[PDB]
A and B are shown apart, each in its own frame.
Chain A
């Protein structure tokens, strides 16, 4: 859907034997904080022996892009489930924000590999600071010198309610 970045802090309930337990922090992409907490408890149940009944949430915040008007390249590490077994990938994207990379990755994996939202794990998202660390060949072509291309055969827009035009259209906009 339409996602945004959160940070969430959890804690085991303090007890007389172990007062002041440790604090854990993760970054979760979720449409809202109600499912952000659910994803926090889901990921934490696979790493530590803490549940929601025996845990608590300390703080939830929203992380916003520092420079949302600058173009940059991103790289995604992830896990998924196939029809038999699990696999690892590494993809790359070119855009202006971190959140849209996760939205595009979800749509891309859902289209090319038929992977739903239930069976996707995000390992790490990193912005490629240089230009010579781009690996995949479908992004290297977008950073070539003096990029320019025409747009042949693009259909003009005609109102969908105005039927019966009076002359043949043209595709030379």
Chain B
């Protein structure tokens, strides 16, 4: 079973610009610019209407057509991200031993780095380098919050996963020792 024609459309708001060349997408708007390369997928791009982009695959199989929506949702996420940004929230959870962190400022480059001390009462100092373009803040709204913000969802989420994955308990029952840092809510910078 080979499918003749499968098509979807993406609207574009009247605020930003997008240009595609040789399967390389450039999106630039009020909050910056992003680049992505999609040369590994055979897709045909076209301009359906004044503000609608269409893309399609011809004579594809079910497995090939399955990947068609993935680019659509990635491009939509980039469109949202370049006009509204992204924001993740994190909480610290300890029972007895407090954990203290220090998100020091730029280290002579755009990258931020986070220092974590006193995890389950350990004297190890553990060092993490954030992806470029992501801003880390200690919240002042109320206590025990870590604020992550940025332009790209992939970098914001991966950096959050780095923070989550670096605080691990070893040789203990993790159903009893619930210590660690976890993400609790994801959203946009505006509203």
Binding site for B on A (CB under 8 A): 137-138, 141, 147, 149-150, 152-153
Contacts and interface: CB of A to CB of B under 8 A. Distances in A.
Contacts of B5: 149
Contacts of B107: none
A152 B58 contact: yes
Interface of B: 1, 3-5, 42, 44, 58-59
A149 B59 CA distance: 9
Contact of A149 (B1, B42, B58): B58
Contacts of B4: 141, 147, 149
A157 B1 CA distance: 27
Contacts of A153: 42
Contacts of A152: 42, 44, 58-59
15 contacts: A137-B1, A138-B1, A141-B3, A141-B4, A147-B4, A149-B4, A149-B5, A149-B58, A149-B59, A150-B58, A152-B42, A152-B44, A152-B58, A152-B59, A153-B42
Given A141-B3, A149-B59, A150-B58, 12 more contacts: A137-B1, A138-B1, A141-B4, A147-B4, A149-B4, A149-B5, A149-B58, A152-B42, A152-B44, A152-B58, A152-B59, A153-B42
Contacts, number: 15
Contacts of B1: 137-138
Q: Is the interface of A mostly helix, strand, loop or mixed?
A: loop
A132 to B, nearest CB: 20
Contacts of B44: 152
A147 B42 CA distance: 22
Contacts of A137: 1
B93 to A, nearest CB: 52
A73 to B, nearest CB: 17
Nearest to B2: A138
A153 B43 CA distance: 12
A11 B41 CA distance: 65
Nearest to B1: A138
A54 B100 CA distance: 103
Contacts of B59: 149, 152
A33 B1 CA distance: 37
Nearest to B56: A150
3 nearest CB pairs, A to B: A149-B4, A138-B1, A150-B58
B15 to A, nearest CB: 33
Contacts of A147: 4
Nearest to A144: B4
Contacts of B42: 152-153
